[PDB]
Amino acid sequence: SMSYTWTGALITPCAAEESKLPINALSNSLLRHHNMVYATTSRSAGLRQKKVTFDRLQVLDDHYRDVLKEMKAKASTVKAKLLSVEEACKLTPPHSAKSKFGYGAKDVRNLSSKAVNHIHSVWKDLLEDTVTPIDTTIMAKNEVFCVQRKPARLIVFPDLGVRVCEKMALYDVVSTLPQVVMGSSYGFQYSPGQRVEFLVNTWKSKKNPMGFSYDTRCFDSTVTENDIRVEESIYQCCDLAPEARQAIKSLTERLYIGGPLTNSKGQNCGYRRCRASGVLTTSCGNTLTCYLKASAACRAAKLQDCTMLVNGDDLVVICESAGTQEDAASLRVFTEAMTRYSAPPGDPPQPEYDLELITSCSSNVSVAHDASGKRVYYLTRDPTTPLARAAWETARHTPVNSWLGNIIMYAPTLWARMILMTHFFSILLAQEQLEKALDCQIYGACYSIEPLDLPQIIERLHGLSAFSLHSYSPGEINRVASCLRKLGVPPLRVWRHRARSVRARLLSQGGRAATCGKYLFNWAVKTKLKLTPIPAASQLDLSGWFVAGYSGGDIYHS
Numbered sequence: 424s425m426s427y428t429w430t431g432a433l434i435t436p437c438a439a440e441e442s443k444l445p446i447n448a449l450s451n452s453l454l455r456h457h458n459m460v461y462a463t464t465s466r467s468a469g470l471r472q473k474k475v476t477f478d479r480l481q482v483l484d485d486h487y488r489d490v491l492k493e494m495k496a497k498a499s500t501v502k503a504k505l506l507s508v509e510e511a512c513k514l515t516p517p518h519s520a521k522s523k524f525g526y527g528a529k530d531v532r533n534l535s536s537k538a539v540n541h542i543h544s545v546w547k548d549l550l551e552d553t554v555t556p557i558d559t560t561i562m563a564k565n566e567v568f569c570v571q572r573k574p575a576r577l578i579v580f581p582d583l584g585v586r587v588c589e590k591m592a593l594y595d596v597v598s599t600l601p602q603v604v605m606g607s608s609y610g611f612q613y614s615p616g617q618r619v620e621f622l623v624n625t626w627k628s629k630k631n632p633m634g635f636s637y638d639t640r641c642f643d644s645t646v647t648e649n650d651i652r653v654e655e656s657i658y659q660c661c662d663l664a665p666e667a668r669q670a671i672k673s674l675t676e677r678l679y680i681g682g683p684l685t686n687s688k689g690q691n692c693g694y695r696r697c698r699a700s701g702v703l704t705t706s707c708g709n710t711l712t713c714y715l716k717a718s719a720a721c722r723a724a725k726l727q728d729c730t731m732l733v734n735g736d737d738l739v740v741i742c743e744s745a746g747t748q749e750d751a752a753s754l755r756v757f758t759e760a761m762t763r764y765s766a767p768p769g770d771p772p773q774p775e776y777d778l779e780l781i782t783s784c785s786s787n788v789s790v791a792h793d794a795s796g797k798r799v800y801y802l803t804r805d806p807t808t809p810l811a812r813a814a815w816e817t818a819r820h821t822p823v824n825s826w827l828g829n830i831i832m833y834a835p836t837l838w839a840r841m842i843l844m845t846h847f848f849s850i851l852l853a854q855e856q857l858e859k860a861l862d863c864q865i866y867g868a869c870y871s872i873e874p875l876d877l878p879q880i881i882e883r884l885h886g887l888s889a890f891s892l893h894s895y896s897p898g899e900i901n902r903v904a905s906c907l908r909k910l911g912v913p914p915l916r917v918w919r920h921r922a923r924s925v926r927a928r929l930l931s932q933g934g935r936a937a938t939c940g941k942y943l944f945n946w947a948v949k950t951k952l953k954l955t956p957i958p959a960a961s962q963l964d965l966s967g968w969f970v971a972g973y974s975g976g977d978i979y980h981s
């Protein structure tokens with residue numbers, strides 16, 4: 424009933440934590456108001472604990488039951504396979520948190536017999552014991568933001584050996600099942616370009632469209648033990664091997680429904696009875712559970728001709744409007760239904776009648792034109808956090824490069840082309856690291872990407888128009904303007920000058936480098952080059968990029 428109970432032991436760091444943006448000239452050239460940029464630390468841990476600790480009340484009705492029955496039926500068409508130990512090992516990130524049992528990620532990846540032997544014993548234990556709660560660690564996340572402060576987030580995860588067994592038992596399931604159950608409503612099957620297409624068309628398919636996002640207050644904590652058993656029952660509808668079924672049942676009872684929390688120093692911090700953020704089923708479980716409750720809520724609210732898009736706890740609904748007054752009332756009913764299901768709103772949802780004003784996944788659809796003047800929809804967001812994090816990553820070394828992932832996800836946008844591409848390609852030129860591969864996250868999963876590949880990647884993901892978008896919407900440009908003012912970032916005038924310098928230098932190098940200069944920076948020059956299709960675009964292995972979400976699931980690809 425209580426999401427968390429606490430011993431009073433502190434959530435402790437594992438190493439010294441930085442919360443301040445250090446000052447050098449390179450980072451300051453990006454962003455002036457460095458005092459607005461912070462990183463959360465375990466020092467705010469207790470504040471987060473307050474927010475996520477509460478009692479959960481839950482009342483199901485017929486709509487909920489009908490929707491679950493429909494989900495299990497589609498789930499019943501799925502055949503999922505156990506992963507071999509070696510397959511599961513390959514999926515482990517190179518710097519994943521080491522086991523407390525005397526081996527690390529590299530040992531796992533290397534198929535060390537100490538690591539493999541232990542993983543066999545964990546697995547055998549899972550099969551033999553389906554009761555004893557499995558230990559987890561709780562840490563405060565170190566994440567960068569821009570002031571107006573957010574308390575750090577808490578991450579909860581089992582030992583490396585357990586995580587590997589998770590992959591063996593459930594990786595196939597969480598990679599295939601969600602899309603089958605939810606169909607087109609499953610958000611992680613889309614690249615950003617594809618998510619725009621689905622949204623734009625869904626909107627155009629309605630005679631008189633209304634739409635809204637719905638933000639659940641601290642979603643992971645609103646997830647009940649019943650919720651977590653319900654997901655398990657959905658997994659079990661799959662055609663599964665008997666070992667898998669047994670391992671899934673055990674992981675569910677021992678790990679997923681809850682368990683003891685141990686801090687960095689090995690002290691017991693308390694006990695969890697809600698979603699864990701750092702396990703393999705977090706994304707799929709939250710997405711299945713968010714979809715089930717919202718689908719039933721749509722029915723309780725009698726929304727007509729509903730289409731949903733769900734990414735974990737992030738929900739957007741587009742339906743037929745019944746009129747402005749009736750719409751307002753409908754959304755209140757919807758909200759009341761969600762609340763009974765245990766998913767109360769963080770902010771009360773609001774009807775929208777313009778697709779571009781709907782924010783989900785912190786992003787929205789906007790419009791611009793290609794070289795031919797043709798309309799083009801593209802996905803964008805407020806640049807603030809991406810820019811704050813770019814400043815941090817310029818001033819410090821970090822394992823994940825969010826700027827790289829943002830360039831890939833938001834390449835069509837003004838701010839990613841004008842600032843991110845210009846800034847970092849300038850830096851890589853100086854360091855002569857254009858060829859060096861970097862790690863970034865996509866839908867939770869870690870990928871190693873070569874910056875010089877960006878032109879092809881962008882062409883594959885967004886299309887050639889990504890390199891010629893212009894006349895952006897005034898509202899979007901105003902939002903970028905406000906952000907640059909707030910953070911103290913140079914205007915288009917400055918970045919155009921910088922981009923021309925970077926473009927020139929990339930050209931003189933020829934090769935893939937000249938291609939980056941030609942495609943990524945054609946916006947910076949007054950005489951435009953032609954920019955035909957890049958013949959290397961069609962040779963890229965992007966098959967697994969946008970299939971499923973893995974946030975917190977410890978997944979690495981390629």
Ligand SMILES: CN1CCN(c2cc3c(cc2F)c(=O)c(C(=O)OCc2ccc(Cl)cc2)cn3Cc2ccc(S(C)(=O)=O)cc2)CC1
Pocket residue numbers: 836837838840841892893894895896897898900901903904907913914915916946
């Ligand atoms: C009140 N005003 C109304 C016009 N508004 C716009 C102004 C518009 C564009 C569209 C607009 F709606 C546009 O499409 C465009 C355009 O297509 O230019 C070509 C271009 C430039 C850069 C890239 Cl990456 C891509 C294309 C260039 N500009 C000028 C501009 C000036 C300053 C900045 S900032 C805030 O970043 O310093 C951005 C844009 C700014 C606010």
